[PDB]
Amino acid sequence: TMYIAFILSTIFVIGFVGFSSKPSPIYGGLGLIVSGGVGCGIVLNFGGSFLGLMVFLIYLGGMLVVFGYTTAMATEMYPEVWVSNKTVFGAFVSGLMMEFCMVYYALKEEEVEIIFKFNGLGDWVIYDTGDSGFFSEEAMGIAALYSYGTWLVIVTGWSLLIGVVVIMEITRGN
Amino acid sequence: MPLVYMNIIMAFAIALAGLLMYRSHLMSSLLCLEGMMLSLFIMSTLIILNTHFTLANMMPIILLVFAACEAALGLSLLVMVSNTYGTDYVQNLNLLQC
Amino acid sequence: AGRIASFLKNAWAKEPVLVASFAIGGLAIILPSLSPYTNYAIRINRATPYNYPVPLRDDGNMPDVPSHPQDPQGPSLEWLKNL
Amino acid sequence: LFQAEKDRRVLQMLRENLEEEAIIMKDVPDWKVGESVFHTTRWVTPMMGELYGLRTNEEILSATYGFIWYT
Amino acid sequence: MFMINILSLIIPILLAVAFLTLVERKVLGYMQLRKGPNVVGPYGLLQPIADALKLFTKEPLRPATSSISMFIIAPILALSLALTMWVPLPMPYPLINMNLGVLFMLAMSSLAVYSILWSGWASNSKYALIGALRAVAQTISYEVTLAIILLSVLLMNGSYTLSTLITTQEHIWMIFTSWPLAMMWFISTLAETNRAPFDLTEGESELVSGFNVEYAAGPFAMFFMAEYANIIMMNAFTAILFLGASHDPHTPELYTINFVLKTLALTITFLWIRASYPRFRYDQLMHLLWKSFLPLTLALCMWHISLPIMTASIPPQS
Amino acid sequence: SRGEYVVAKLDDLVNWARRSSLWPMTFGLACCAVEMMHMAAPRYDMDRFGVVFRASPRQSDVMIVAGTLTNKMAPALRKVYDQMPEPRYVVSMGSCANGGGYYHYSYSVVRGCDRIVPVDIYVPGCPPTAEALLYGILQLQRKIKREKRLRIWYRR
Amino acid sequence: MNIMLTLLTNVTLASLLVLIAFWLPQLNAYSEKTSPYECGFDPMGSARLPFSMKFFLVAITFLLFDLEIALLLPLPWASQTNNLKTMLTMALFLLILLAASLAYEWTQKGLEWAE
Amino acid sequence: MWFEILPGIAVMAACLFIPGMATAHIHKFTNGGKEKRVAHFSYQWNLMERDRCISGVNRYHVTKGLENID
Amino acid sequence: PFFDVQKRLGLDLDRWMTIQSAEQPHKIPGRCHAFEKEWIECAHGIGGIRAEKECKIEFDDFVECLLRQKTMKRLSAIKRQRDKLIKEGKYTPPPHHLGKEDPRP
Ligand SMILES: COC1=C(OC)C(=O)C(C/C=C(\C)CC/C=C(/C)CC/C=C(\C)CC/C=C(\C)CC/C=C(\C)CC/C=C(\C)CC/C=C(\C)CC/C=C(\C)CC/C=C(\C)CCC=C(C)C)=C(C)C1=O
Ligand SMILES: CCCCCCCCCCCCCCCCCC(=O)OC[C@H](COP(=O)([O-])OCC[N+](C)(C)C)OC(=O)CCCCCCCCCCCCCCCCC
Ligand SMILES: CCCCCCCCCCCCCCCCC[C@@H](O)O[C@H](CO[C@H](O)CCCCCCCCCCCCCCC)COP(=O)(O)OCC[N+](C)(C)C
Ligand SMILES: CCCCCCCCCCCCCCCCC[C@@H](O)O[C@H](CO[C@H](O)CCCCCCCCCCCCCCC)COP(=O)(O)OCC[N+](C)(C)C
Ligand SMILES: CCCCCCCC/C=C\CCCCCCCC(=O)O[C@H](COC(=O)CCCCCCC/C=C/CCCCCCCC)COP(=O)(O)OCCN
Ligand SMILES: CCCCCCCCCCCCCCCCCC(=O)OC[C@H](COP(=O)(O)OCCN)OC(=O)CCCCCCCCCCCCCCCCC
Ligand code: SF4
DSSP states (O other), X not given: OTTHHHHHHHHHHHHHHXXXXXXXXXXXXXXXXXXXXXXXXXXHHXXXXXXXXXXXXXXXXXXXXXXXXXXXXXXXXXXXXXXXXXXXXXXHHHHHHHHHHHHHHHHHSOOBOSSOBOXXXXXXXXSOOOOOOSSOHHHHHHHHHHHSOHHHXXXXXHHHHHHHHHHHHHTTOO | OXXXXXXXXXXXXXXXXXXXXXOSBHHHHHHHHHXXXXXXXXXXXXXXXXXXXXXXXXXXXXXXXXXXXXXXXHHHHHHHHHHHHSSOBGGGOOSSOO | OXXXXXXXXXXXXXXXHHHHHHHHHXXXXXXXXXXXXXXXXXXXXXXXXXXXXXXXOOOSOOTTSOSSTTSSOSOOOHHHHTO | OHHHHHHHHHHHHHHHHHHHHHHHTXXXXXXXXXXXSSXXXXXXXXXXXXXXXXXXXXXXXXXXXXXXXXO | OHHHHHHHHHHHHHHHHHHHHHHHHHHHHHHTTOOOSOSSSGGGTTHHHHHHHHHHHSOOOOOTTSOHHHHHHXXXXXXXXXXXXXXXXOSSSOSSOOSSHHHHHHHHHHHHHHHXXXXXXXXXXXXXXXXXXXXXXXXXXXXXXXXXXXXXHHHTTSSSOHHHHHHHTTSSOHHHHHHHHHHHHHXXXXXXXXXXXXXXXXXXXXXXXXXXXXXXXXHHHHHHHHHHHHHHHHHHHHHHHHSOOOOOSSOTHHHHHHHHHHHHHHHHHHHXXXXXXXXXXXXXXXXXXXXXXXXXXXXXXXXXXXXXXXXXXXOOOO | OHHHHHXXXXXXHHHHHHHHOBOBXXXXXXXXXXXXXXXXXXXXXXXXXXXXXXXXXXXXXXXEEESOOBTTTHHHHHHXXXXXXXXXXXXXXXXXXXXXXXXXXXXXXXXXXXXXXXXXXXXXXXXXXXXXXXXHHHHHHHHHHTOOHHHHHHTO | OHHHHHHHHHHHHHHHHHHHHHHSXXXXXXXXXXXXXXXXXXXXXXXXXXXOOTTHHHHHHHHXXXXXXXXXXXXXXXXXXXXXXXXXXXXXXXXXXXXXXXXXXXXXXXXXXXO | OGGGSHHHHHHHHHHHXXXXXXXXXXXXXXXXXXXXXXXXXXXXXXXXXXXXXXXXXXXXXXXOOHHHHO | OOOOHHHHHTOOSSHHHHOTTSOOGGGOOOTXXXXXXXXXXXXTTSHHHHHHHHSHHHHHHHXXXXXXXXXXXXXXXXXXXXXXXXXXXXXXXXXXXXTOSOOOO
């Protein structure tokens, strides 16, 4: 077992608690990068190496632009960190306490939330016995974006081009 | 359901609560909005990899594409607001009233 | 044709990078529809056996399905051997 | 050959898991050993805990993460 | 034995970094008609040792206005990622054999970007902030171009495994196959590693040492080590990707010797370029990639997608 | 004694590193700075001896005050000297830095940089030749070679 | 497991280097030494004030093009399919749309930094 | 002269030789004098696990043959 | 609301991706291909109301294959009982479960 997936899920939740308590965009981006890397690890354990690396790379590229924008638009004289503000520390501690309560309850018993029912057992238990051979099922399914999924490619490309046009039009000003 | 799905859904709920509770900056809200889609990506790929839905493996990529399209839209609106007011504070977006 | 020649002369003297970029892109778009080896590439991708060849239950009326792999019936990769 | 070996190994692990289940769940008031959780009688592939349920952590780890962690 | 292999991968890399410092000093000196360090040891061989001891026995200070947490983390992240990039390189056998070994290096490089950003922002000084923003722009441009160039070159290969790169380059060289992409990739690696003419984050002429202006003693040495490790790692990646060496499974030492020689040749080419050219402006660097490399990169990507199909030369998947 | 031998060897090792790796700050004020360039030049290459210019004061061990120090400039010199981390050394080069020089009786010149910073080596001349400055650097190295910080501490 | 061990080793070595750097040498800090650097004079303002970003549009275009390269990355596996013509058409379609985005921005002057 | 640069490049090359040769020697040492098995797919991993099981010593590199079947 | 242009024109825009029993690349089977096929075949052509009333057994088997809730309940029950039995020394695991056997090839 080794509980690697559960530990990484907990770190994922902690990073979300950080950037949702929202100290300042610098530390929010730091927490979001940490969460993205840990999510890459989670999906790597579950099987998807390409998907994990892709989400990590995309968020690493995206948080770079956010740093440049918060240096320009969203900065103040004394940027707030988690211990700097009472509201930020309160929200961070509340999120941490809620996550720890859920973790403890799930480990001690089969925790059924008000929304869904969760069973405390092996992520290794839920896995499948069967195997593929001499190809990666995830890689083949993603590569089927071009043979299958011609419609998805069309709508995605149109959306990207229109996004370029839109961001040029919004910032026109005048 | 395993506890992994519980953690991912809890992270999504935390990010959703972060977006709905503004503090001062619009940029922090955009970061919370980007985290929600990260959690959605992780949840969808965990579900798809577990059931061996081979053709669904392309869905998380489209999810990422429209995620960053939304991020681009938000950054453009943020620069226009900053040009108008000097800061990205949400308090300045008060000219229109209900 | 003189207008086109003058435009290409001016573009090659001001933006050779763009001239080369468009030429390479146009060659990439057009050439595959004229090359005779595209069908060969398709057949080579088909000839790769990723999964197991599940056998058919013989009904006594399948003359084109070999009884043994070495039988003359069945697909032949002799074209691929000498390629 | 590997298909035959895989089927025989899977069936043997299921049989010994069933024997251990019969030994353990003998004092349980309402418990039928080997009862399926599916209405259908079609053969259903064991998940991971039906095979490597009552086994050592080393074997469990190898079976569940050996391929992914092998670098 | 795996810990032993990790140590054998780490310690020689640091030693090679120190002697790359010495080699760059001497090569620049001889190109500038000087001798370079030749006094500290025999042919100046103890100069890196003297520099390292001096730096780590000197006093390091945290600026009064700095954010101490991100002030410390940044050199740690830089050196950690610099050492980590070496683990999937086949020489001829990788330490960690990854099915997708190239995307791992791309992701780790994109993460290695943030060390300089966080060190500059944490220092809380105007020169550091200017260097950090120069880093932002540089990473934008080189990142997009690097992604597409690597895509095309690996498309000539069949997969994302560096051992498969060796197998592909068994007979000829990817430089002979795709030299234009090789030129653009070399320029992109210069930009990625922040070497001249693209040394804009640490541009001494405009900024006083750039993003690490406030870093002193040990934390500065870690940034220097990380930069030089990145230089050597990128040159090794280029040598593997474009200058393929013959591999003999029973005597693998020959591949190691050839790989090391090609890596040293590319590193010396880096030093040569630094001695030979002036420095770009960062707006001119951004306009160089987007307006010159990106069109050619897209056209060559289309060409290298089409070429295997039209010539029936699609590489095997595995 | 064993401890005395160990501390002697250790502080010989530490002094060797500091002597053999000297990083002057990129800081020149007047005509004496041209002779620093000629010391950096191929004829008297200072890079041979491990002497390398660094722009940032945080990454410099030696401050070579080469030129006239004016009243309008003295605060900047003291500021950069303070920002240099320890151990740090000062080489005053030329008459203007040493004493007053040609401008000793002037309303706008500080009569010696030793009024502002603690100077370790004084190099005379107007300007000192590149060989004279190199001799001063070597004399500074020999002065570092005599430092016994660990030997003082052991007997402290 | 192996990759986790490698990452732990690298991080531990870097942290040990930092710890040695911050504890081995003699420390002597005061207000003047740790003040910020501005070429010898006190800074007029603060380094936390907004720093105008003259290439704000190129950053957003970079986000979109990063999405495009993410879409293009699975091409080596897509070239092993039997529908080579459909795969080629879709790959070229995506590349042509990326080129069209670049051409539109270039002609509409989105690559020119703000003055 | 320009050949005073060679000792530094020689030391750098000697340092760069160590990782690859060390990795090759360790791979051969921990795999019975043979190359480390490359398992990029589930089929190759299943082959390695079968080799471990049939070896009788819990080592996949201990290869068995005709003398073992009969 | 729903304009079935796909059905009218004979096109296929997302029906290939709607379900996991459809044509997959390299004929890779889904985890619950058999259960999904059985449920779809049961519920075809009778509408939503009759599908929910009458194919409930097939849907329950499909959901069981998807989520594995009853299976995990049984496994947790067996684990708890075994842990209780070995806590008081009333159960001794066999060597083949303790790792002292030679498995099958
Ligand atoms: C003020 O007006 C001016 C002047 O004045 C008046 C002038 O004069 C000049 C003239 C000056 C110039 C023209 C140039 C000056 C400007 C510059 C910017 C300098 C230019 C110089 C260069 C371009 C080249 C010089 C080199 C430089 C600058 C690099 C600096 C070197 C370093 C930072 C080296 C430090 C890093 C190191 C040593 C690496 C770290 C160490 C290691 C990794 C080693 C560790 C090893 C281990 C841990 C392994 C140990 C274990 C082992 C061995 C085995 C153990 C095994 C076991 C099993 C135990 C000008 C222009 C001027 O305008
Ligand atoms: C947080 C990291 C933990 C893991 C560390 C893993 C190994 C680290 C290896 C790198 C070491 C880096 C430093 C190298 C040596 C040079 C510096 C040096 O000597 O520093 C030592 C430091 C030196 O103190 P200093 O602050 O004067 O340092 C100046 C050092 N010189 C003069 C050389 C510049 O020693 C101490 O701080 C402690 C000295 C004795 C006083 C003890 C106080 C009590 C607390 C500690 C003892 C244990 C108490 C147990 C009971 C607790 C409950 C009551
Ligand atoms: C980088 C990784 C960390 C390494 C940690 C240290 C590892 C060992 C470092 C290697 C030590 C090298 C010592 C070099 C000896 C100096 C060479 C010799 O020339 O110096 C002579 C003697 O030097 C000094 O007397 C002592 C130097 C050091 C003597 C040995 C110190 C202890 C070394 C062994 C302990 C190292 C391990 C313990 C710490 C980890 C005096 O000559 P010098 O005047 O200058 O030269 C002027 C130039 N001229 C001649 C042209 C004019
Ligand atoms: C022309 C109509 C104009 C009015 C409607 C406009 C609506 C937007 C434009 C939509 C145009 C495309 C619609 C048709 C999509 C075809 C999808 C699919 O059915 O055809 C593909 C055929 O693709 C063809 O190669 C050409 C695809 C289209 C080429 C680019 C057209 C771009 C036009 C749209 C521009 C962007 C604007 C979109 C928003 C307005 C599949 O062929 P196949 O080989 O069996 O796939 C293998 C599947 N297997 C494995 C199961 C067998
Ligand atoms: C449809 C097939 C091609 C598919 C895509 C091609 C690959 C990608 C190339 C497109 C990327 C973007 C293209 C952008 C083009 C417009 C950009 C532009 O505005 O250029 C202007 C206009 O300059 C021009 O001359 C327009 C470019 C003309 C090139 C088109 C030539 C057509 C090529 C025909 C092929 C002929 C074959 C000759 C082969 C020669 C050897 C290769 C100059 O730029 P400046 O704004 O002045 O620079 C900043 C100065 N302050
Ligand atoms: C075979 C077994 C092993 C044999 C060798 C064992 C030792 C190896 C080296 C271990 C590290 C050093 C250990 C401590 C050495 C003594 C340091 C010391 O106590 O110095 C105190 C003293 C401070 O000055 P003080 O007299 O207190 O005056 C107060 C200020 N007015 O003086 C000072 O602080 C002087 C300033 C420098 C002090 C630090 C440097 C000491 C020597 C370190 C050499 C190794 C450096 C390695 C660097 C990292 C790797 C690159
Ligand atoms: S001492 Fe002479 S050469 Fe030097 S700065 Fe003064 S006037 Fe110039």
